[PDB]
Design a binder for this molecule. Sequence first.
Ligand SMILES: Nc1nc2c(ncn2[C@@H]2O[C@H](COP(=O)(O)OP(=O)(O)OP(=O)(O)O)[C@@H](O)[C@H]2O)c(=O)[nH]1
Ligand SMILES: Nc1ncnc2c1ncn2[C@@H]1O[C@H](C[C@@H](N)CC[C@H](N)C(=O)O)[C@@H](O)[C@H]1O
Ligand code: NA
Ligand code: NA
Ligand code: NA
Ligand code: NA
Ligand code: NA
Length: 288
Amino acid sequence: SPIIKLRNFNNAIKYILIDKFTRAGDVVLELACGKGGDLRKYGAAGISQFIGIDISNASITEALKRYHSMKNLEYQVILITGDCFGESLGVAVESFPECRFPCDIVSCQFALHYAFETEEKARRMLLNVVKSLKIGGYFFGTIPDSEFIRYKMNKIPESVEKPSWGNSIYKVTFSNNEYQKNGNEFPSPFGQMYTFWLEDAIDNVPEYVIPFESFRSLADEYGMELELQKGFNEFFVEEIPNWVNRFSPKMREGLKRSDGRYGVEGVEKEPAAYFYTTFAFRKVRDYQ
Ligand SMILES: Nc1nc2c(ncn2[C@@H]2O[C@H](COP(=O)(O)OP(=O)(O)OP(=O)(O)O)[C@@H](O)[C@H]2O)c(=O)[nH]1
Ligand SMILES: Nc1ncnc2c1ncn2[C@@H]1O[C@H](C[C@@H](N)CC[C@H](N)C(=O)O)[C@@H](O)[C@H]1O
Ligand code: NA
Ligand code: NA
Ligand code: NA
Ligand code: NA
Ligand code: NA
């Protein structure tokens, strides 16, 4: 399946990204952890403690069910329902004093753009990140790539009321064309909504652009400086040599293309390799 190949590729991206920044003994806070599908990736990195928070009780229930079916684990796991973006994290974690804060790593996969609903939420998310992180610690994850979004939008005429593009397995549909009416610039970095469909994965969910320059400038205000901004394709090309043989046999065969090399080809290439970017920052100073 194109979708199976996409899932395997993005799973590989996460393995690589987690390993790149997470070191043995680290304490990890995972924001918007969903159903907690990356635990084994953090275990491979040798962490000491994992704290996962998600706003969905149904997702946390599933993550706890997945956790409790694991065995011989060498790290502690805390899984919590709470709002990571609209409220202070202290609300979510107060009844879990076993959390070891500040932590060494904050991660967030396929979710941070929901914090760009408004400026207030973007700032609250960043304040939660930096208050949780030690000086010198890292914040990393995976988001839709505003630069690829802008490329596509720059090819859409102003006559289109709901700018849209896609292929047989994915589709983006913007709520409005204010980008096009405003000289190919969003009227605000925040709240710029589009619905995202990905076959058998994402059911037309509204989400928000995360303009990378605004994310970066806000992060700097809160004391975090840029470490990584490579799109999935470039990231994979650069890192796969060190990993081709680190991956499970099943993940490796899944990554093999028809020409015998590694990556994605075919219809899944655009959504898997171009639509998303990695990000990482380092906390370099305390924020008042
Ligand atoms: N644009 C966008 N894509 C997302 C979002 N969440 C997930 N994705 C995409 O959907 C893929 C995940 O497909 P799933 O079927 O959810 O697989 P999974 O995350 O491995 O499985 P679970 O642990 O059960 O959640 C990701 O690799 C991304 O391509 C999102 O909020 N926005
Ligand atoms: N304000 C919020 N605080 C915490 N989690 C949120 C918030 N808004 C959305 N989410 C979660 O963000 C997640 C988005 C998912 N696309 C990604 C989940 C997970 N990281 C994964 O990669 O599978 C969901 O699990 C949502 O419930
Ligand atoms: Na972006
Ligand atoms: Na819009
Ligand atoms: Na936006
Ligand atoms: Na986005
Ligand atoms: Na920055």
